[PDB]
């Protein structure tokens, strides 16, 4: 009867693509819950692992992040988080430490993934070398493009492994996702993947 599930808070500056991202998971969108007391949509996102199903209950704001911190209730009982920024907007990356501070202040050492969204856009401003130069311990990073589903599953798999304590956990099938609205150019993806690997291994 009981199902494994985690509260995941999705935070980051307004306009970074948080809502676009969470909405790629089709069943999470059709089964989302609106929490009137907090102005939040909770999207129940199921992923099927080699040990069975897990659900990330992702908390998506209603835009209030533009007017200062979120209320404590947003964070309460969070078990994990994604911090999002926009790789075309350096200001959104410069605010990452502020979101990270707010998270630990209420939730302490929950696992967190950092996502640089909109990598489908050619004129990229926040590149791998800068992201790795400012890499924070325990803050796993991924390039994502919500609009093309690029790397959609990676933040969730990393968090699941940390939460369950099972480094060999796998997703046996991708969730049903909204069809890509833009093409993630393969040449651009290969370049960004290479740039990341170089930054992470270069001496």
């Amino acid at each position: 009867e009981p199902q494994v599930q985690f509260k995941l808070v999705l935070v980051g500056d307004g306009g970074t693509g948080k809502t676009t991202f969470v909405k790629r998971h089709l069943t999470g969108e059709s089964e989302k819950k609106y929490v009137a007391t907090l102005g939040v949509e909770v999207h129940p996102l199921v992923f099927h692992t080699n040990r069975g199903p897990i659900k990330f209950n992702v908390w998506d704001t209603a835009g209030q992040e533009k007017f200062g911190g979120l209320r404590d209730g947003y964070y309460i009982q969070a078990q994990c988080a994604i911090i999002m920024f926009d790789v075309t907007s350096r200001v959104t990356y410069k605010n990452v430490p502020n979101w990270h501070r707010d998270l630990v202040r209420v939730c302490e050492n929950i696992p967190i993934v950092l996502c640089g969204n909109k990598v489908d856009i050619k004129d990229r401003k926040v590149k791998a070398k800068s992201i790795v130069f400012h890499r924070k311990k325990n803050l796993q990073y991924y390039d994502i493009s919500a609009k093309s589903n690029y790397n959609f599953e990676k933040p969730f798999l990393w968090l699941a492994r940390k939460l369950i304590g099972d480094p060999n956990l796998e997703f046996v099938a991708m969730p049903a996702l909204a069809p890509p609205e833009v093409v993630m150019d393969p040449a651009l993806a290969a370049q960004y993947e290479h740039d990341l690997e170089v930054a992470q291994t270069t001496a």
């Binding site: 929490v35 007391t37 909770v42 069975g52 209950n57 947003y74």
Partner: protein, 40 residues
């Protein structure tokens, strides 16, 4: 093989799931710690 969640996973006794925001709450709480929705 036997580490499947159906065999090894169970929730705290008396735990209840908030019908409004899905947060899992203590049996001793009358309201949701996150969103204040009352327990059913």
């Amino acid at each position: 093989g036997s580490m499947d969640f159906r065999s090894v996973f169970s929730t705290k006794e008396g735990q209840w799931d908030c019908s409004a925001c899905l947060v899992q709450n203590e049996g001793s709480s009358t309201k949701c710690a996150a969103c204040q929705n009352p327990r059913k």
